[PDB]
Homo-oligomer: A and B are copies of this chain.
Amino acid sequence: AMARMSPADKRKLLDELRSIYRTIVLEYFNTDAKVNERIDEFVSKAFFADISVSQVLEIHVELMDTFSKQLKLEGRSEDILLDYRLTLIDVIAHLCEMYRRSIPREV
């Protein structure tokens, strides 16, 4: 029994990582929004919350389907979908970089 670490808290994290990730996308094109704070928040929690890229990869797809769907119903240039790819790849690359740094190596 993790120090009171129930499966809910993790889900809560997921719930937040979900929105946080989402927020990162919305602010990806922000004019003054420091998306870094979003990416930093997601990155920090993702690492700390021992979150695997899986959810980042899977969660991304679901949300992406959300945008593509609207584009169809709203008949809007779906090209904007490239942002998610830039956000998905950039996000993963950002936290993935943190992992490499969290690895103490001799030398």
Most buried by B among A54, A93, A96: A96
Q: Count how many chain A residues have C-beta atoms less than 8 Å from C-beta atoms of the other chain.
A: 15
Interface string of A89-104 (1 = CB under 8 A from B): 1001100110110110
A88 within 8 A of B: yes
A31 within 8 A of B: no
Assembly CA distance A97 to B96 (angstroms): 8
A76 within 8 A of B: no
Assembly CA distance A52 to B92 (angstroms): 13
Interface string of A5-46 (1 = CB under 8 A from B): 000000000000000000000000000000000000000000
Residues of A at the B interface (CB closer than 8 Å) are 52-54, 57, 85, 88-89, 92-93, 96-97, 99-100, 102-103
Residue in chain B with minimal CB distance to A2? B107
* Nearest 3 pairs of A and B residues by beta carbon: A96-B96, A53-B93, A99-B99
- Whether the Cβ atoms of A99 and B103 lie closer than 8 Å is yes
Residue in chain B with minimal CB distance to A88? B89
